[PDB]
Amino acid sequence: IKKKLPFRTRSKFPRKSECVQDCAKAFTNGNKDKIKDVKSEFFSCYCWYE
């Protein structure tokens, strides 16, 4: 399932690693393993997880 990252990322176009960790904090209580995909966006990026 897909959500937008709630808040502004520390980097303009965050890297896949940056996005997976941001999604982990936002939606999986920091558990990176449950984040199944990421899509970089401007000061934001989209999160895919179960």
Next chain:
Amino acid sequence: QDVFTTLVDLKWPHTLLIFTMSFLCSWLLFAMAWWLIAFAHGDLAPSEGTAEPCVTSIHSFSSAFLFSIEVQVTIGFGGRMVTEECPLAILILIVQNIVGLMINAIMLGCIF
């Protein structure tokens, strides 16, 4: 050999055609350079995420062409940017900036 006198002496549609063709040729040549570097680094193959690209988000020749336009005209959208991974990208960035300033200056002086 008196090439700049010819370039000034061309009638205005001819001069505009020369300068837009020179800018387009420089953009396409360095687009080919960026695309070749991105292939040779493996950035064109989809990858999970261990390695970092020379230039971010270069997925095809269209990305390389947009990036070459961005660096030469210094717009710099930043979706595709040079990283510190391969020094060949840094060298090509230096060369493209130098020749972009050079041919921009040549065109600028000719039509002045």
Next chain:
Amino acid sequence: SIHSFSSAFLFSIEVQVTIGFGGRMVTEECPLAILILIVQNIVGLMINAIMLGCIF
């Protein structure tokens, strides 16, 4: 995102040629970076103008 001298070199290229990719950008933390940004922009416009006029 200044991690080495390569990041500083790419950033110096970005600010002087005004490409500005924005992965490495000046923040408001230390004013010395602001002063160096001002100085680099001034001398970049200056030497760009000098070269431009010379080859004109």
